[PDB]
Design a protein around this ligand. Structure first.
Ligand SMILES: [Cl-]
Ligand SMILES: [Cl-]
Ligand code: NA
Ligand code: NA
Length: 129
């Protein structure tokens, strides 16, 4: 599924991400835009052999099991394919574990480079929330 901007904002709000660990909703929407272009089916392979999955591009070296990343942890205890669903619940629940691990949203390279320090409220402007 490819989400609309306000549709995703609303879905993330219902799932408890607005101000989760102090990150306002616009941060999560901005990160999704530049990680996946709001496409739940997005996958990208990394140089080390791991792969990133879903709307928030969660990596198989630490967070999920894809059966092909040797030595990986599955810290979210989920197959990586569950992260590609039109239902964002599994991605959101895993993202909450990631953002709580010490480095906040700096875990997402595109957030650090394209959202951090910008007017992220613009990503939810106009939405009925
Ligand atoms: Cl915001
Ligand atoms: Cl980047
Ligand atoms: Na929309
Ligand atoms: Na893994």
């Amino acid at each position: 599924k490819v989400f609309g901007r306000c549709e995703l904002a609303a879905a993330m709000k219902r799932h408890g991400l607005d101000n989760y660990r102090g990150y306002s909703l616009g941060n999560w929407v901005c990160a999704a835009k530049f990680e996946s272009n709001f496409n739940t089916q997005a996958t990208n392979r990394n140089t080390d052999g791991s792969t990133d999955y879903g709307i928030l591009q969660i990596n198989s070296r630490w967070w999920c099991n894809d059966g092909r990343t040797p030595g990986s942890r599955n810290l979210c205890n989920i197959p990586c394919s569950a992260l590609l669903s039109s239902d964002i619940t599994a991605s959101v629940n895993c993202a909450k574990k990631i953002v709580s691990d010490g480095n906040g949203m700096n875990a997402w390279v595109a957030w650090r480079n394209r959202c951090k320090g910008t007017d992220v409220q613009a990503w939810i402007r106009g939405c009925r929330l």
